Design a protein around this ligand. Structure first.
Ligand code: ATP
Ligand code: MG
Ligand code: ZN
Ligand code: ZN
Lengths: 49, 692
DNA sequence: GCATGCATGCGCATGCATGCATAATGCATGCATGCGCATGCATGC
């Protein structure tokens, strides 16, 4: 944890980021629900089976 | 076999490790002291991580390691690091808690060729180069001892050492046997300092007809931020190819790109001395004569620049009435008077000074703007030279050539002492507490004594009103002064081929005195004399109105006070006395009178001779009278005869009469003065005459 | 009626056709923007 002063020169637009996702299967239409995403700039890899 | 092949095997590795440990333990200086003892002790006193080794001593003690060093740098450096770590941990046991590794760096070497000669023969070798830094990437966290999290289970894979050549790709998760994917455990990973530098040949060493060439280098761990862009450095490094992506494959010939990996870079009593110098009664004249050693004459300009450098003290009762303490300086001169040399000297001396020119293509602009930097390719807010010089000096050359935007920004920064920006969605106000020194030329190319200062200069009255001190440098043909100036110029040219003040202070001593006076001297006005100031102000305004042009105003008095403070800062006085007030009065009166035209200037100079004669020299005034008479006689001779005569003579009676008019009755000391001999004057009693 | 023959019957091994289980990485494309150039419009004097 750090504390730092500065001056702001650029600010991007407000966008949307997901924290809980749900995915569906092609054939049997089963679902995996309430998968928790990680905070910050981190992605997620879908399962294959 | 190759050197690195023999290095790789374990036997000679352990033998060399033992040899290096013994070299570390047993190495002593020429005087018998243990060098590594004191070195590691002073390293321990500051918890450092790096150790420096000389190639000369290494070759003297153990020759085989020195011989193998150039052609196998990485493994040998690793072995030496292990040996040094073992020895240090033997000396002290706490570093296992503080630092788990210690780097070894080579300091001296037989100098290696420049950037031009590096070719295929130098690959994977140890080299030493010299160059000029042009850019830096900053500080970056590189990986080391990486821990990975499996994405099917949540197992944490063990630490993996990150080599500089290839990325680390874990094979499979030891528990669930999955082939991937994996991500980096941010919390348990260890990180290292990384920086990248571009180096260009020094422009002075490049032969005519070819261009300088550049190369890239990488600094790690303690080497980061050890160089500033624009500096000249020397590196010891490894000329490398074996990094992924060096081979050109997509199109074109099979060309490799080379990179250098560096491991070394080669570029109390003073307070008592300051107090002792302050104890000297003539420190002020020493400081005045200490400015601009290389410029002849213009003593008044140097005296003014002294106050400008030392400065004053801002005052703001509450948050209502702000009064600055920065003394601005303006110079107006005919060509060839060396106005720019003063600015160059001031930039050299000043701790924080910015230089810019109004003609165009300046290295530093005079207006703030937001832009993508051409080099770093980043979106930056570049403020003008005025903002960058906080509590510093800003120098502007070619003051008249400035366009509209520069004039507007300068006016705003001088009158409000802040710069406002509204650009690209950014609205800011920035502080511009800086002292402004400027130089300029007259409108017609030559100063006209029959016109006021404002009529002679392209600038406007509001801009001129801001400056506390105005100096006018007019070129006039004086044979003795021209002879002396030519002598100095020719002497400077001859010296630099490749094959009143008792003593000026040293430049470093002057810098230290300036810093100490600015930090710890705050003169107080608790002993001012308001009666004399009020009477003099009233009389000045009265006679200004009597002449009928350019009346004085209250602002000048403020400048005087500031100058007084500056003088009190010179002697380290904590209180203001009458001497500083009188000197500031003289300076302000000279500046005010010099801006008037001929008749008004003459009348004011004659009437105010009382105040302007404070701490003056009578001999200088007599020399001025003699010069005026000589000039009159020479002008008459040239106009009537059409040519000059071989000798110049003047009766003593006229000089005596004029001295009596200035209330001076004795001139023998003037005859015996050094000023009389310096101008090659002689006095003959056989004819009561003065000859030149 | 007692001695003998024997067609029926049951449980565990191997052989062979079908059937079942597994399972991330590298390369390509369009959007944003710098840098050099020539035309052209508008503004002074
Ligand atoms: N008093 C002096 N002492 C030493 N050198 C001098 C002196 N007066 C003039 N010079 C020399 O005269 C030359 C004129 O160049 P310089 O840049 O100093 O001129 P400048 O006054 O700034 O002129 P400009 O008005 O054209 O900007 C310089 O090389 C400078 O060294
Ligand atoms: Mg100049
Ligand atoms: Zn399914
Ligand atoms: Zn796993």
């Amino acid at each position: 944890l750090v504390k730092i002063p500065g001056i702001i020169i650029a600010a991007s637009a407000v966008r949307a980021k997901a924290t809980r996702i749900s995915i569906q299967c092609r054939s049997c239409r089963n679902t995996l629900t309430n998968i928790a995403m990680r905070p910050g700039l981190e992605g997620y890899a879908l399962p294959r089976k | 076999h190759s050197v690195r092949e023999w290095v790789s095997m374990a036997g000679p590795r352990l033998e060399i490790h033992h040899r290096f440990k013994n070299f570390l333990r047993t190495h002593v200086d020429s005087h018998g002291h243990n060098v590594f003892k004191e070195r590691i002790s002073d390293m321990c006193k500051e918890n450092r991580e790096s150790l420096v080794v000389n190639y000369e001593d290494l070759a003297a003690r153990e020759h085989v390691l020195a011989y193998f060093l150039p052609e196998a740098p990485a493994e040998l450096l690793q072995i030496f690091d292990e040996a040094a770590l073992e020895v240090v941990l033997a000396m002290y046991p706490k570093y296992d808690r503080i630092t788990n590794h210690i780097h070894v760096r080579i300091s001296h070497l037989p100098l290696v060729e420049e950037l031009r000669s590096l070719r295929q023969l130098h690959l994977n070798q140890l080299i030493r180069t010299s160059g000029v830094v042009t850019s830096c990437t900053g500080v970056l966290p590189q990986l080391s001892m990486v821990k990975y999290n499996c994405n099917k289970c949540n197992f944490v894979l063990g630490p993996f050492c990150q080599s500089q050549n290839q990325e680390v790709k874990p094979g499979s998760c030891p528990e669930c046997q999955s082939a991937g994917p994996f991500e980096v455990n941010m919390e348990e990973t260890i990180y290292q300092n990384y920086q990248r530098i571009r180096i260009q040949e020094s422009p002075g060493k490049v032969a005519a007809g070819r261009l300088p060439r550049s190369k890239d280098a990488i600094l790690l761990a303690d080497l980061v931020d050890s160089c500033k862009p624009g500096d000249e450095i020397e590196l010891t490094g490894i000329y490398h190819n074996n990094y992924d992506g060096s081979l050109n494959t997509a199109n074109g010939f099979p060309v490799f790109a080379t990179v250098i990996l560096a491991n070394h870079v080669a570029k109390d009593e003073d307070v008592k001395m300051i107090t002792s110098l302050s104890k000297d009664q003539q420190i002020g004249e020493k400081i005045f004569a200490s400015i601009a050693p290389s410029i002849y004459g213009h003593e008044d300009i140097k005296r003014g620049l002294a106050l400008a450098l030392f400065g004053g003290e801002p005052k703001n009762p509450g948050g209502k009435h702000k009064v600055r303490g920065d003394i601005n300086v303006l110079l107006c001169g005919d060509p060839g008077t060396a106005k720019s040399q003063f600015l160059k000297y001031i930039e050299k001396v000043s701790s924080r000074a910015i230089f810019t020119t109004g003609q165009g293509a300046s290295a530093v602009g005079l207006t703030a703007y937001v832009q993508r930097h051409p080099v770093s390719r980043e979106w930056t807010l570049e403020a003008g030279a005025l903002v960058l010089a906080d509590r510093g000096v800003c120098l502007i050359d070619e003051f008249d050539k400035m366009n509209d935007q520069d004039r507007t920004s300068i006016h705003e920064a001088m009158e409000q002492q802040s710069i406002s920006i509204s650009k690209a969605g950014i609205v800011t106000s920035l502080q511009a507490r800086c002292t402004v020194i400027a130089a300029a030329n007259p409108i017609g190319g030559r100063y006209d004594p029959s016109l006021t200062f404002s009529e002679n200069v392209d600038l406007t009255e509001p801009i001129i009103s801001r400056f506390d001190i105005l100096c006018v440098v007019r070129d006039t043909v004086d044979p003795v002064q021209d002879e002396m100036l030519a002598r100095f110029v020719v002497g400077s040219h001859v010296r630099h081929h490749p094959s009143y003040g008792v003593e000026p202070l040293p430049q470093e001593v002057l810098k230290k005195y300036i810093i100490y006076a600015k930090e710890r001297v705050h003169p107080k006005l608790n002993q001012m004399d308001q009666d004399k100031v009020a009477k003099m102000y009233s009389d000045l305004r009265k006679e200004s109105m009597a002449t009928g042009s350019i009346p004085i105003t209250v602002r000048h008095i403020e400048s005087m006070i500031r100058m007084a403070e500056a003088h009190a800062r010179i002697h380290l006085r904590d209180y203001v006395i009458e001497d500083d007030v009188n000197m500031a009065i003289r300076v302000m009166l000279e500046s005010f009178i010099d801006t008037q035209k001929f008749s008004v200037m003459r009348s004011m100079r004659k009437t105010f001779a009382r105040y302007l004669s404070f701490r003056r020299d009578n001999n200088e005034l007599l020399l001025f009278i003699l010069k005026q008479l000589v000039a009159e006689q020479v002008t008459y001779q040239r106009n009537r005869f059409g040519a000059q005569q071989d000798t110049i003579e003047v009766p003593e009676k006229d000089l005596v009469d004029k001295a009596r008019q200035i209330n001076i009755h004795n001139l023998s000391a003037f005859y015996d003065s050094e000023l009389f001999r310096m101008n090659k004057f002689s006095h003959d009693l056989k004819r009561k005459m003065i000859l030149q």
